[PDB]
Each structure stands twice: as structure tokens, then as C-alpha cells.
Design a protein around this ligand. Structure first.
Ligand SMILES: *Cc1cc2c(cc1C)nc1c(=O)[nH]c(=O)nc-1n2C[C@H](O)[C@H](O)[C@H](O)COP(=O)(O)OP(=O)(O)OC[C@H]1O[C@@H](n2cnc3c(N)ncnc32)[C@H](O)[C@@H]1O
Ligand SMILES: *Cc1cc2c(cc1C)nc1c(=O)[nH]c(=O)nc-1n2C[C@H](O)[C@H](O)[C@H](O)COP(=O)(O)OP(=O)(O)OC[C@H]1O[C@@H](n2cnc3c(N)ncnc32)[C@H](O)[C@@H]1O
Ligand SMILES: O=C(/[C]=[C]/C1=[C][C]=[C]C([N+](=O)=O)=[C]1)C1=[C]C(C(F)(F)F)=[C][C]=[C]1
Ligand SMILES: O=C(/[C]=[C]/C1=[C][C]=[C]C([N+](=O)=O)=[C]1)C1=[C]C(C(F)(F)F)=[C][C]=[C]1
Ligand SMILES: CCCCCCCCCCCC[N+](C)(C)CCCS(=O)(=O)O
Ligand SMILES: CCCCCCCCCCCC[N+](C)(C)CCCS(=O)(=O)O
Lengths: 495, 500
């Protein structure tokens, strides 16, 4: 057997961040990675046509201080996603350009309904503990409803319900009827609320890494050398003896003091456990699917949309459109002009039966309509990735919780099982679902082990992160009218 | 490698029925079973205090002709569960004895609401094809609602909503808010509807096997001999070469022409696939949990409840009650008197924290109150099994579908993946979730392979089953009033119109 201090299962950002922290503390770590690459739900493809492209997780922004610090230490730089010109909201077959993060509305009833929807998402979130959403005062009530039920109650207009639906589909790559209202409300609040999660400027989509986010995992693999074992899917963990035994599919055995599980929760099902897992974890890992998305990048000769004072952001309502959301993916130098779009949730499943060339035609025709430009019909290149097909991800971006699961099983997610500690972005308390949450959870799991070893005190397990000097956060603000305008039923109670 | 025609993954009733059919057809089969025993979600415990007891699946009944036929061919016999005396419905801390399968209501408005609830479940079921529920005309609308939402729309009384809640909890070991309305309506219709699924006499809970249901899998293992490999959990299936390669945890390799996967769909996640599964199955097997249940059997000196004209059936509403449903589990000889009860859904999670002795105490106190009998506080023995702890089951009785999954992913549940065919009760079209459905699916998967091999024509893949001569099925009937009485909103519309 190969003997080490800690085996880390998974070489995504979380497992690499955990392995780096333990290595830096002087422990002998091994990373066992199922794939022939590191990075997991991050994947940067390089070729002459694109230079580089993120086909998985890409964006970082203010308040994501851990991923920004880790990347800076590994030598990476960010650049800003283009948001100089106007965003577009495409509604009932017409483009409405706008500025500011929230698509505006002009009808006064629709205005009250939209304002109340976003305000209510944040009001509900203020009662949900980031580190324990099952402790929300209405946890059971909210966990026993889907987001479809909540939007049916809250939205008096079809306009608000359609945009709220798009919000859920885009944020969590899942239908409103698939997901728990408590879990969705927690998910938004633990990113800093509605404005922060939906924003490019001053929010989650502000920046990308120069050369791709895959460099985070690749550069930690560079540091660790042959401590990273590629094509070593873990099949078996045995905790019955003095040392933990970890077996891989290619017949290798690893012996360690402790294990970090840095894989999506449900992919724990791919490991046979001795002794069996405790009942609550045994069932939990069958109840926590990942969402569905195709990330598609269409390349053009120039960023032609900018000539029409459009930044390349499109928010596209309705069933017919394959893509509900796009961002400008042009490189910081103005070259490799491109539009990134997502095919979300049921559409990822519906449109997966098409060929790559058929998806490209649908996207170009959509973009030609929304940007009002024939130039959209002349792509020079195309790259896409359907994350639903990945055996060792299960989907993207993250794990969602169907109704009833977070209150019954949520407490299990980061509970250690003897000498197995749990990392992965699903176990974070701030930007869970993101690269930021991956770093938080991997470093916290590593520090749980250092505490178990008697190397650090209990109060050092959870550590605050200084604000980035390069990407400072501006405050989220609201107006008097936003805070105090009535809801639609509120306007009716006054009549 | 060990070479054969067909590797069957899983030695539950479904894999064992598949293996038996293939063996009987002259093929070389191997069964790879993870556990040190066959039977899976069936498990018959034998000891001197109980003689035998089913801690997993137990009951069979009219219309379950495949399991009856298989068991009969293996030399097994059935007996009837005791339903001679009155059933009890316990609600708001009082017991109401009754006869007939449905707990009755006297309040006229409540009666309309109850009648309409059961009628509507079956009316909706008649829109849903057993072999393709996603083809129901309103499949998307019904799949995008939980059963909680459906009961909130349908039940105009708390009485009906509370009974309907217990019905879902007991039938599918899940909460109403956990499960798709389309899936639940399918599940009930593919068992023959509300009356058949809830009934003891003339329904699913009519009979048990003398000596236990585990004998089905055990007697097939006896016929197959050393073809059944115990403690062989499958970890890897490789279809990249001319023969399929199947690898076990204990480092054995099996080579076959075809594979039958006879495990619960989500337990396919325990296998690494080369090439990877197609996208739809890859995601489906992360979306289909099994329910939660502890099956608990309390033994007594005598079946004392019969002396009070109670058969031992208790239908118990109330968050405080650990157990929502019981049956008499006395042996057919009248000895080893016992009450079987289920701890369902969230209660199986909440009460798993307790010791075995603490659960026995809570159950005895409950039974004493419901039966009005101090004798219930004098148990002589106790057996239980929490199925939520089983690595190689995932839960019991069966797999449930949360909202949105059956329409998006249901088409791939029994779609072959190259040379992998899918059995297991979850893939059945009649009594899916039951031992009957295990037999249907195992035999159908085996015939798909016989067809692939050119041994049988396509029209022999799906085969009807002659009715049991031992267990005749009475038809499900309704009265004129049951068919035509209005719902509560129907009555309100009649009132509004009159007064006009
Ligand atoms: C896919 C995706 C993700 C995504 C996104 C868009 C798409 C299409 N957009 C994002 C964004 O713009 N910004 C952001 O911060 N995140 C975004 N995301 C999500 C992000 O990619 C993920 O949150 C993060 O990458 C998750 O990291 P984590 O380290 O927690 O998880 P992982 O990447 O899935 O890594 C797990 C690794 O484990 C290996 N594995 C799996 N099973 C085994 C076994 N049995 N044995 C050994 N290794 C195993 C996987 O192969 C993987 O490398
Ligand atoms: C648990 C339970 C079930 C049950 C019930 C009450 C309880 C508490 N009441 C029932 C009843 O009264 N009447 C009835 O007809 N059914 C009832 N059920 C359901 C019933 O037990 C199940 O429907 C039926 O037994 C399912 O049979 P099936 O053959 O489809 O599935 P299985 O029994 O789960 O068998 C699967 C086997 O596969 C092995 N396994 C799992 N993973 C692997 C791997 N990787 N490799 C090899 N073998 C594997 C399992 O160990 C099992 O033996
Ligand atoms: O929820 C939103 C965006 C999330 C989001 C989450 C993860 C990853 C990414 N990304 O990679 O792009 C975007 C949103 C929503 C809206 C709105 F208002 F239309 F609903 C307008 C803009 C953005
Ligand atoms: O749905 C019911 C019972 C299913 C059921 C399904 C599987 C296995 C078993 N079992 O082993 O006991 C019982 C039911 C429901 C009622 C009612 F009406 F109260 F809801 C009254 C009696 C029975
Ligand atoms: C009208 N809708 C918005 C459908 C229901 C209002 C919800 S409620 O009436 O406020 O519960
Ligand atoms: C006046 C409101 C009574 C609500 C009754 N419930 C049963 C709650 C809803 C009926 C739904 S539906 O109205 O039949 O669609």
C-alpha cells in the first residue's frame, strides 16, 4: 500500500485547496483523481481558434475573497467581463436594452410585483442561517414547498413569474418545481442576496481569470507533483483498522490517517464503504442531484454587438429560446470575440439529442434576433460542453435539494464519518456552488484534520478571509421606494 | 475471467427470477450478489423466539399472479393475514372500530370529500398509461406538483387531507411534499387502484408465505447451485470489447454476452461504467431515492386483541404516534402472536436515534392506548429492521420520484444500455415496488436478452400471466352513489345555481 498522512478524494478546486493547505503544513498528502485531468467542474480548453476557453466554472467577483487569494498566490490575474454598454431583456419577441442589474418594467402593477418579488427573496433570506438553513424559523414550511409553489403565491403578474422562473433556472440549473424553496432561498442569501448573485459589475459575474479557471487546479497539481494520481477513481474506503484504506479502480491501495472527500455529495455513492455509512448519510447521498446545463461559446470575427451599444448580456424569456442568458466572452484585448450562453435545466435535456452543428444554428439564429444583427449568423468557431454527461460530476453547476431534503438530511452534509471529513463546494457556507465555496470547504476540511491531529485549536477550524485589494466589494444598496412600495395585494389591501 | 452467457447483478427476487428463466432456457448464468445472502429487500429472520419473521417484503395478494406462480413452482404455500375481527382507525386520540377496507366517515360533508378523494385518485390514474406515465395528457402539469399540492387542491376537509397523507406515507414510505403527484398516481393505478392497494382481504396485504418470503430467493439459489456468487459487489462494467467485463470488489472478473442490472436504479451509482452511461441515465440514477421505513414486530403471549373483536389492524393518525399502520403477524397455527407495525418516512429518520428498547416501549404504549388494552404493555419479544441503513438497498419499500423527474427521465428507466438490460421491481408495469413487480421485470429483462440472441420473437418479450387458481381476484366495484355523489366544490356549485 502507498502510505501517507491524508488521502484527498477528488482533484477539483476543493480537493486541491485542501491538499495544498495540508502539504504547506508539512503533511504527506495524496490526491486521488478519477479523471485524466484535474479541475472537475472547471475545465479550460486551449486551441488556436479560442486561445483558451472556460467550458466549466469561470466567473469570480467581489466578496469571493478566498478564490481570489488562492488564485493570486498561484500567479493568476483577473479581467472584467464586458458590461460597458447596455444589457438586453428580450420579452415577447422584442429586445429592450437597459442599464443596472435588474431588468426594468414600465407597467405600474408589474413594477410593484417585480419589486416585491426580489425584496421578498432577500427578506426571507435574512431569517436563514448560512451555516444551518434547517434552523430558519419557518424551515419546515419553506422546505416542504417547491420554488414553483412559492412563485405561484408571490407573483401576481405573469411578467414577474416568468423572470423569477428564469432567475431560478439560471442560478441553480433546475426547474422551479424541482427545488425546495428553503434551499433556494438559502442558496441566494449565502451568496450575499439577489443583487450580488445576479450582478456582473459588483457581483458574482464581474471577472474571469486570464488564461482560464482550470489554472487554479492545474497550478496546485504543478506544486504537488506526483502526489496527484490521475485516473484513480476511488471505489472503496475501509475504516475498520488502525489506518484508513482507500482502494482505486486500477487496483492501487492507499493507507492514511485521515481522508477528505472532495467530491459532489451524491458521487459518494460510487464508493463502497466498510463499515457501511451511518443511515442518514447512506440515504442523503441518494437525495441530492446536480443540475443540468450545456455551456456554449459562439466565436465571431469582432464583438459586433458593441457597435450597437450592447455589452453582449442577453436575458431571454420564454420556452422557445434555447439559451436564456448570455455574457460577452471576448478576451480582454478585444480579440477572440465570443458570446457565452447557457442551455438550462429541461432545455439541456431536450436539446442534447441535437448535433453540435444543429445547436450552433439555433444559437446563432437566436442571437441574430436578440442582438438585431445578421453578423450573429456568421460564427467563426464553436465550443460547447454538456455537463449532464459527466460520470464524475453528475451535472453543473452544483447540487440542488428537492423539497423536504435539506431539513431532514442537511445536517449530515459536513458531519465527519469516523476519519473521513467532507469538503466540496456543497459543504461551504458562503458561495456554496461556486469556486469560492470549493476553497472555503477544502481549507475548512483540511483544518478539521489539523485540529484532530492536535496541530491547531478548535477556534482556527473556521477562518475569516481578508477582503481582496484587487477586487474590493461595493455595498449593496436599495432606494426608499424599493424598500417601501407595496406589493400588488398590499396595494389592494389599501382598496 | 469466469465466462458465461449472462451476468445478473443482484440476487433479489428480480435477479433470481431472471437467472432462473435464463437457466431454464439452457443459458449459462452467474448471479453476482453484494451481500452474504440472497433476497435483497426480502429478509426472513429465523430464531427460536419467532420461528421465522419477514423483516422486509412479506405480503402478496390477488392479481399478483407472477409471484404466486413462481412461489408455487418452488413449493411454497400462502396463508391469509388475520382480518376476521374489526379494523381500528385511531384519530385525534380515539379509536373507531370498523369493517370494510376504507375508514368510514359519518359527517355528510366529510363523506363527500372522502368519497371524492379516493374516486379522483382513480379517475386521474385512468389517464396514465402503466407502461408510459409521461404520456398522460396532463403529465407535465401533474409531474410538476407534489402530492402535498394535489391534496391541498383536492381535499376540502382536514379529515380527508389527514387520511390521504397517511395513505401516501404508508404506500410509498415518503412525505407528500417529497413525491411527484404524477408518479404517485401512476404507482397506485399500476397496482390496480386505491381499493386494491389498501385492502387486506382482496388486496395487496391479503397473504403471506408460510415460512417467509426469503424462501423465494433461497429456493432459486438452491436450483442454481454455485452459479450464485455471494459477497460479490459489482464495481465496474466495461462494454468496450466484444464480451462485457464485470468486475467485483473482491477482485474477480466475469465475462458475458449480456448483463442484467437487477438492483434499485440509484444503486447503479455504485458501479463505474466504461464507456460512461448515456447522459439521461447518468443523471436519472442521482434523482431516484428510496423511501424510509422501520418494520417493527412486537410479540405477545396471545393475540389478545382478537378477544376484544379487533383483528390487529390499526390505522393511526397523529404526529406523536411512532407507527401509522399495523397488521396481525400471528402465525397461521395461532402461536407466536405478534403485531407488525411500520415507522414511516420522517418518523423513521426521527426515531432511528432511539435504542431498540426505547422504540419497543413507545410502540407498546401506543398499542395499549389504541387497543385500550394494558396487555399491550407485556411484550415477550421484539424484532425490527431500519431499511434506511442498508448500503445495498438504499431504503424501502421502493424508489420514489420527486417532482419533475418521471417526465424528464422516466423513458430511460428500462431502456437498454448497449448489452446491459434493466430488471428490478422499479422497472415493472404491474405492482412495481412489490415482489410481483420484481418477478415481472426479471422475466421481461431475461426475455429481452433471449430476443437479442434470436431465441424468441419480439412478441414473447412481454407475456401475460394466467390468474392464480389459489388466490382468486374479486373485481373492484363501486356503488351508484360512490360514482355520482358530488365533490364538496361540486355541491357548492349545485347550491349557487339553485339559489338563482
Ligand atoms: C460546470 C459548471 C460549473 C460552474 C459554472 C458553469 C458550469 C457549466 N459557472 C461557475 C462560475 O462561473 N463561477 C463559479 O465560481 N462556479 C461556477 N460553476 C461551479 C464550479 O465549477 C464548482 O462549484 C466548483 O468547480 C466545484 O469544485 P469542487 O472541487 O467542489 O468539485 P468538483 O470540481 O466536482 O471536483 C470533484 C473532483 O472529484 C473527482 N471525482 C469524482 N468521483 C471521484 C472518485 N470516486 N474518485 C476520485 N475522484 C473522483 C472528479 O473527477 C473531480 O475532479
Ligand atoms: C424493505 C421492505 C420492502 C417491502 C415491504 C416492506 C419492507 C420493510 N413490504 C412489501 C410487501 O409486503 N409485499 C411486497 O410485495 N413488497 C414489499 N416490499 C418491497 C419488496 O421487498 C421489493 O419490491 C422487492 O423485494 C424488490 O426486489 P428486487 O429484486 O427488485 O430488488 P432487491 O430486493 O433490492 O434486490 C437487489 C439485490 O441487488 C444486490 N445489490 C445491490 N447493489 C449491488 C451491487 N453493486 N452488486 C451486486 N449486488 C448488488 C442487493 O444486495 C440485493 O440482494
Ligand atoms: O441569476 C442570475 C445569474 C446567475 C449566475 C449564477 C452562476 C453562474 C452564472 N454565470 O456563469 O453567468 C450566473 C441572473 C439573473 C438575472 C435576472 F434578473 F434576469 F433574473 C439577470 C442576470 C443574472
Ligand atoms: O395504503 C395502504 C397500505 C399500503 C401498503 C403498501 C405496501 C406494503 C404494505 N404492508 O406491507 O402493509 C402496505 C393502506 C391505506 C389505508 C388508508 F385508507 F387508511 F389510507 C388503510 C390500509 C392500508
Ligand atoms: C393570485 N395568486 C398570485 C395566484 C395567488 C395569491 C396567493 S394568496 O392568495 O396571497 O395566498
Ligand atoms: C374559497 C377557497 C376554498 C379553498 C379550498 N381548497 C381545498 C383549499 C382549495 C381548492 C382549490 S380549487 O379552488 O378547487 O381550485
Amino acid at each position: 500500500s502507498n502510505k501517507c498522512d491524508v488521502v484527498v478524494v477528488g482533484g477539483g478546486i476543493s480537493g486541491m485547496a485542501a491538499a495544498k493547505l495540508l502539504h504547506d503544513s508539512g503533511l504527506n498528502v495524496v490526491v486521488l483523481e478519477a479523471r485524466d485531468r484535474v479541475g472537475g467542474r472547471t475545465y479550460t480548453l486551449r486551441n488556436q481558434k479560442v486561445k483558451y476557453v472556460d467550458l466549466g466554472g469561470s466567473y469570480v467577483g467581489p466578496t469571493q475573497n478566498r478564490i481570489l487569494r488562492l488564485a493570486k498566490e498561484l500567479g493568476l490575474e483577473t479581467y472584467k467581463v464586458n458590461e460597458v454598454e447596455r444589457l438586453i431583456h428580450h420579452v415577447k419577441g422584442k429586445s429592450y436594452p437597459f442599464r443596472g442589474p435588474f431588468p426594468p418594467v414600465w407597467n405600474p402593477i408589474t413594477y410593484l410585483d417585480h419589486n416585491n418579488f426580489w425584496r421578498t427573496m432577500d427578506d426571507m433570506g435574512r431569517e436563514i442561517p448560512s451555516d444551518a438553513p434547517w434552523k430558519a424559523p419557518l424551515a419546515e414550511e419553506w422546505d416542504n414547498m417547491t420554488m414553483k409553489e412559492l412563485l405561484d403565491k408571490l407573483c401576481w403578474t405573469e411578467s414577474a413569474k416568468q423572470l423569477a422562473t428564469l432567475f431560478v433556472n439560471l442560478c441553480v440549473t433546475a426547474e422551479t418545481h424541482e427545488v425546495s424553496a428553503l434551499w433556494f432561498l438559502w442558496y441566494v442569501k449565502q451568496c450575499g442576496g439577489t443583487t450580488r448573485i445576479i450582478s456582473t459589475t459588483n457581483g458574482g459575474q464581474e471577472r474571469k481569470f486570464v488564461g482560464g479557471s482550470g489554472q487554479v487546479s492545474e497550478r496546485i497539481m504543478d506544486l504537488l507533483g506526483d502526489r496527484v494520481k490521475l485516473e484513480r477513481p476511488v471505489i472503496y474506503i475501509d475504516q475498520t483498522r488502525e489506518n484508513v484504506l482507500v482502494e482505486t479502480l486500477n487496483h492501487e491501495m492507499y493507507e492514511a490517517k485521515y481522508v477528505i472527500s472532495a467530491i459532489p455529495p451524491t458521487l459518494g455513492m460510487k464508493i463502497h464503504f466498510n463499515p457501511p455509512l451511518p443511515m442518514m448519510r447512506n440515504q442523503m447521498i441518494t437525495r441530492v442531484p446536480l443540475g443540468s446545463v450545456i455551456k456554449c461559446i459562439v466565436y465571431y470575427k469582432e464583438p459586433f454587438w458593441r457597435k450597437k451599444d450592447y455589452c453582449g448580456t442577453m436575458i431571454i424569456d420564454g420556452e422557445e429560446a434555447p439559451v436564456a442568458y448570455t455574457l460577452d466572452d471576448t478576451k480582454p484585448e478585444g480579440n477572440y470575440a465570443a458570446i457565452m450562453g447557457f442551455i438550462l435545466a429541461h432545455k439541456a435535456r431536450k436539446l442534447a439529442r441535437l448535433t453540435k452543428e444543429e445547436r450552433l444554428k439555433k444559437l446563432c439564429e437566436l442571437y441574430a434576433k436578440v442582438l438585431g444583427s445578421l453578423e450573429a449568423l456568421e460564427p467563426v468557431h464553436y465550443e460547447e460542453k454538456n455537463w449532464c454527461e459527466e460520470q464524475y460530476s453528475g451535472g453543473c453547476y452544483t447540487t440542488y435539494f428537492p423539497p423536504g431534503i435539506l431539513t431532514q438530511y442537511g445536517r449530515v452534509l459536513r458531519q465527519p464519518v469516523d476519519r473521513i471529513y467532507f469538503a466540496g463546494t456543497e459543504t461551504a457556507t458562503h458561495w456554496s456552488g461556486y469556486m469560492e465555496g470549493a476553497v472555503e470547504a477544502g481549507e475548512r476540511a483540511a483544518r478539521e484534520i489539523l485540529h484532530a491531529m492536535g496541530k491547531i485549536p478548535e477556534d482556527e477550524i473556521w477562518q475569516s478571509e481578508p477582503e481582496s485589494v484587487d477586487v474590493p466589494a461595493q455595498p449593496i444598496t436599495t432606494t426608499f421606494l424599493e424598500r417601501h412600495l407595496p406589493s400588488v395585494p398590499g396595494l389592494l389591501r389599501l382598496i
